[PDB]
Design a protein around this ligand. Structure first.
Ligand SMILES: Nc1ncnc2c1ncn2[C@@H]1O[C@H](COP(=O)(O)OP(=O)(O)O)[C@@H](O)[C@H]1O
Ligand SMILES: Nc1ncnc2c1ncn2[C@@H]1O[C@H](COP(=O)(O)OP(=O)(O)O)[C@@H](O)[C@H]1O
Ligand SMILES: [Mg+2]
Ligand SMILES: [Mg+2]
Ligand SMILES: [Mg+2]
Ligand SMILES: [Mg+2]
Ligand SMILES: [Mg+2]
Lengths: 371, 7, 16, 371, 371, 371, 371, 16, 16, 7, 7, 16, 16, 7, 7
């Protein structure tokens, strides 16, 4: 009767059972459809492909994500994702388990309400609860105090918590995320003559980003170095055996997070955004937030990102203060893990929306602890 | 381009 | 440090 | 030889000549700069834009205000504001006229001292005086007794005056103002999926606030109504032709003034703040302050604000007493008007700091009647 | 069977056992409650926090005092203070010990009557007595003659005693106290641009007051000095590492005690108030009161306060007379100490209200020696 | 009720029944007519001869093909071919069986439409379907992925398929085929004094090509060898007993496929054409196409052709990739075989155009899956 | 000393002098070489032919373009183009005039660097500047605001400009252009039996495209019409007197620009690409970009293209907005014209790279205003 | 009520 | 590998 | 010579 | 954020 | 509208 | 001077 | 086919 | 503000 946990993010879907250390399903939130005439009718060709199935056939599919910037925009595709998650990936009947789902803070309310309707009416879940990843990331870190900087494929957000109490007026959110860094990389590679256009190519460029990019701890020095040296150049083999050689794009891509102006945003970079979140908090709480800067989410995996963040925050913050970044290797999974913990606490078993309650209260019930 | 009047 | 242990930590905190 | 009057507020700059009924210059306190690469060098592109010029080009500028919460933080930008006010907006040589400037009570002393230095050394004004808007608001109301609640873009403040004498220990000040209400509205609109992020978008949201928001005279009943009715919904056309439909945000935004907790402040709302100011006054003066509650400033323009204030004050104050709110339609201009009056009184012509005096006394002279 | 002694002041609660030299419990009279949404339900979050517990979490609590100007206004919060004092701070069963409590002179009678009801009906104390701190301060000074100037967080009062007899018609009381000095300091720091608004910030400002302020022995000379010198400036580190630099606020704050006009009071300063108390006494007693000016209470801890008082009293009083100020370092504890002494005297064991007597006499019994 | 299968190619007509391993009719697509005066009227001389009948009498007939470069140009002759195929070669009534016919990709639409009209109106076939040989060649190879290089007497074409989906924008077609190689050989043999002019002689030269030619795996080395050696010379006996000795024509003929310039074409050779087809495909698909290069068609029978193709493709393609050529011995029959398979699949029985549908829809129906 | 202006596009080379209304040289970017054995040695036969010379002899040359998709791939051929442009077409010594060259946005940096090296080292130009055609197209339109949709033989691109400032993050580029439409037309004509294979034939098909094709304002209605009518059919006379009759290919060819899927691209059509560029711009700028949609480039010459674009954009864009397309008849020349203007402005004479500067700075100097 | 009139009111108050 | 077997292979693929 | 305007 | 140690 | 005129327009804009 | 001693002082005063 | 790893 | 009709 273990609760199901499912982090339906914009990039990957991480799902499994409560009370455990890893998702069992980690396939991408991608639904693809053929973009070409089928001819070999005799093989039983499909109309659509999902997740790993879709990426394995990406060169013939217009791969699309149902979720963009944390918002579900394509509900038919989202039900396909869920359907496969429950029956083909986890092999579990939804009727037999309550389910914990996640969402970004400061999202549209309708996103939560529609997701709830589907779980109760299409999957017949007996109970449901929706959590904010930033909160789950502290449960997963073993603590009740700190700022979680959750930076994934969809959105980047900062949520300070102190002694388990949230400070919602200090939530900062940027719609700058891994998907944009990827788009930026697709454009920057143009300079060296490489041209990635299609969605299959987008996934290739994503793979490149994941293996070659790093965070400069001094952007200008890395630029000066690149301009005078081959030592920063790396090769990568494309799926067709073609070799692509990449230079300073390796650090100019993630630099966007510190300089969003690179993609046209006037918005503050992540170190200033984090800093501002601290500044919006009562002065008495600042010391503890600085000492508990918690990173989570896939884009926090760039080598050097934690080090760059420390350097940047210490340049904004007053001196004579401990500024500490917590960045465990499971940054990709801490949200799922938090879900795994929360759903297993006895203290949480009164937080579930029972289908019976939903059916009498209507959607307003999903906003208990809306935050 | 995913929000409703801004992205 | 693992969910089984993190649960024990949080259950202890809640009770205390 | 008419004195110049210039209310260099945080939102708008209201300026003109003494002895008249309106400012001639009413442009915003905004200095913007290009945030994008210029390419058409052949058009004579500028480095910065000011006021209406800047708002007219806002989609390409990082519009910023030089004044925040009543304090001047960017002096270079402030000199640009003044420069344009004097030479391009009012078309007047500063050397030929004495100038009356304004400031919030309980501001940093340095703000007054620096402003003075600039007027005497950069604009060569022959004489200067600095007034408190709360005082000017009573001159403009034709009376010597009452509490002025001046609530603008920058700060909100309460200054009781009795028979022209001030009661400085009863001054109340909140750093809750129209700019915060605007920021709150930007956040609250998130719930319906609208997302305004940039500074140009901030100005759009401000325009929305100004046309759609109103004060609930019963917050809970308006919420109950909104929850059960489309009759409170209004549409607005965004600059690109996109229609945005707004529901209970129409009254949840200004409600912040009564419930500052909505934006994280623990502070008293404006009706309790006003009440407390009265309570800090001698018991003998309370009757007259209750009978002369004077509203001024741009945020006092929300429909229903005066009515809500009466209802709230009468719930705090003892019964069997006349509680009266004075709210003439020129709430946006009463400060400028007070300046126009004061600078024209013969009784005031000894209050001016002559440049000659400044040059011998130094900055301490600006604090005559510091208050 | 040692009596419990508990000085439930407006600032701090000093409590312990009779017959000893110090309170064991010295936590603040503060009850705080969360002002933000709790999210981490799994941590067992509380509804309220008390004393040191509350200050340790002050950045998320609307810390409030149950007692203001010596009067208990919030009885639910006061029972929480007592509850913790008895069971968590002193670890003692109230049923096993009689209890000595304190109160300001010239307070509302109801304050004494309600406090008594609670001790007999909620804590089941077997016996009770209520003392006036000004009297306890002489027991603690080893003498039966003099004027006690007790100036704490709540109120400031003067009670002349001669040969153990009180002169009640000469009691002077001001509602000017450390909490007002703190509020004044919060306002005065505005001048240098610092802004402390919230209750957590109030406690920060209190800490500042306690470390940086001093009494000018010549106010005008200190002002002239400050106006011409950096030698009086001191830095302080705020909890978030931000440094605040404070100038003449260091002595303009405590000056309020000599010039209450600084906060709007027309009332006499403490040196004139003390003097007037002496003048209301029979001429034959004046010599002994002048020779035994006894200071007690936390605000008498400002450096230079005793010296300023001597200088001021000698300027009011006739010459050729010994004017002596007694100011032992335990000014913060002399009241508790007096309680510790009084409750231990055999002569005092008939002064206790036995619960049995209360239950037959009713509340009028608490006014034996009402004074 | 077994479907008839008939690959009406430009060279040979391969026809038989679905569900079997070989055509039963494999006669040439040749209709000949006497080119000389008949004199022995008493023998019942014919006006025309078909297929093997015609070749057996070729020395007196102007043998012509009805199909050139994959296009039917002589419809009267084509009906004769079909007539004999159905009634004299296969001995089957067309009315009793549905029929699967084939055609080149990128042919004129009219070729398909006219063929359809004839089958429905002249042969009364109850149903019809037209397939592309390149597709049939993968069914016959047991796979759903790869590029079929079908090089026959008529045309040479490349059609990539991935997971059964076709990539039509990557279809490459050359009008260089076995008939041109034959014409080139007729010309090249001139150098050694042999002269083949007539159509009967064309068929003789074709026979020579089929037995003596091979693909050089290094053209220049074979030329250098021929220029210095008799070891590459082979004899052939012409029908009249005359011996013809052939030298480097043995490899200069098929070389045309790699160097079309030999016959005046500026077009890419077959290895570059294949390569380009791969390059027109999404990068993600290239690896699988390289690993599944499928050869079919009669001209792929030259000894050494598969080996030359591997050598050439590996010189164009990036290194570190598996380039694999599939060349089963039944290259002459794989198309017919694919037809035999396709027509037998239950999945295909809805693909047939029923005569009833044709008669209501008109010719547009033949382009379902036109490709 | 008039600057030379030379738009070395992929299709045509437009070159002449600054300060004038037309290029003097408008020959094609084609270098051809004989593909056949020369025999009449006595006529002084050439190795290569250029531009009009080459097209005039196209039936014997493998005509090739040095530039593909806006990138120079064959530098030897490009120097021949330049050589002839300077000495045989314009009859001018390069040493005597500075030269303005053009390039596509988002091209490889090396393309600019190599072009620069050649102009300074091979042609000894005293100075050089490289411009982006999209910018030049607004100078030529007399305005500083709008989106230029430049669609030529090489690439199609969208560059929004506002008040002369560029919005580089909103640049959209497709590698769909007139050369692809031509290739598509070569393929589509197959359906009616016409077959154009060689490069000379490619140029013939291009001529056909230019005279017969038009944009359907309703694609499905034109298809339905074609399917039922001869009224859309047009004849064309091929160079050998052969008449070719063309049906719906007349509009199915340019339709590719709206439906790139026709040639295998998954990419957005030009109306969605334009729209997306607007969406990537700040909301405040959208109104002006919609009102200034500027078309330039040779493929914008199809009849009906401007009308189709308006219809399409108004179906994507919100209603209640003015959507305006600017399409002057000189769409083929507006780029050259912009060059003619820019090079003549006094404001531009500091933008030139002086050879002296290049020789000290190296290639990085060419990226001033890289964009 | 207008500056000309408000001035007259205040000048009168000052003189009185 | 023979039509009977190739049919079985493709029928299996279609069904799967 | 079999196409219609090319072979 | 405009004061000096509080906003 | 012609280069001579477009130049005059832009020179005027630059100077202004 | 300490409560134990101050008590002794006051008890002595009361008795005397 | 003109870019470097895409056309 | 803590008394009853004076603070
Ligand atoms: N109809 C309206 N309702 C509510 N607020 C308004 C309205 N019109 C303007 N405002 C607000 O008034 C403020 C401008 O204040 P104002 O007193 O004119 O100048 P300042 O604040 O600079 O002294 C802005 O925050 C603006 O949004
Ligand atoms: N060094 C110091 N200088 C001046 N005032 C102080 C100092 N230390 C503490 N105080 C003040 O003493 C007051 C506490 O008073 P206290 O007599 O101990 O308890 P209560 O006022 O509750 O009877 C507070 O207002 C506090 O700020
Ligand atoms: Mg996530
Ligand atoms: Mg104002
Ligand atoms: Mg006390
Ligand atoms: Mg064939
Ligand atoms: Mg061009």
């Amino acid at each position: 009767t273990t609760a199901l946990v499912c982090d339906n993010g914009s990039g990957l879907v991480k799902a499994g059972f409560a009370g455990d250390d890893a998702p069992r399903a980690v396939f991408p939130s991608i639904v693809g459809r053929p973009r070409h005439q089928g001819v070999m009718v005799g093989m039983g060709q499909k109309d659509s492909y999902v997740g790993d199935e879709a990426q394995s056939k990406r060169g013939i599919l217009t791969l699309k994500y149902p979720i963009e910037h944390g918002i579900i925009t394509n509900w038919d595709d989202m039900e396909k994702i869920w359907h496969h998650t429950f029956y083909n990936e986890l092999r579990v009947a939804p009727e037999e388990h309550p389910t914990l789902l996640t969402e970004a803070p400061l999202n549209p309310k309708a996103n939560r309400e529609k997701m709830t309707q589907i779980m109760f009416e299409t999957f017949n879940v007996p109970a449901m609860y929706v959590a904010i990843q930033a909160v789950l990331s502290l449960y997963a870190s073993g603590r009740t105090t700190g700022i979680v900087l959750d930076s994934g494929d969809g959105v980047t957000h900062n949520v300070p918590i102190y002694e388990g109490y949230a400070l919602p007026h200090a939530i900062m959110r940027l719609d700058l995320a891994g998907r944009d860094l990827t788009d930026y990389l697709m454009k920057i590679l143009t300079e060296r003559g490489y041209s990635f256009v299609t969605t299959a190519e987008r996934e290739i460029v994503r793979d490149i980003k994941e293996k070659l990019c790093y965070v400069a701890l001094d952007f200008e020095n890395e630029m000066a170095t690149a301009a005078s040296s081959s030592s920063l150049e790396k090769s990568y083999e494309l799926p067709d055996g073609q070799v692509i050689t990449i230079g300073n794009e390796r650090f100019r891509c993630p630099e966007t997070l510190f300089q969003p102006s690179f993609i046209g945003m006037e918005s503050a970079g992540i170190h200033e955004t984090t800093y501002n979140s601290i500044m919006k908090c009562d002065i008495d709480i600042r010391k503890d937030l600085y000492a508990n800067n918690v990173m989570s989410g896939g884009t926090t995996m760039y080598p050097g990102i934690a080090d760059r963040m420390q350097k940047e925050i210490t340049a904004l913050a007053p001196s004579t203060m401990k500024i500490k970044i917590i960045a465990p290797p499971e940054r990709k999974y801490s949200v799922w893990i938090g879900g795994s913990i929360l759903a297993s606490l006895s203290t949480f078993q009164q937080m579930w929306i029972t289908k019976q309650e939903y059916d009498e209260a209507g959607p307003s019930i999903v906003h208990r602890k809306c935050f | 381009p995913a929000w409703x009047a801004x992205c | 440090m693992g969910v089984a242990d993190l649960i024990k930590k949080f259950e202890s905190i809640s009770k205390e």
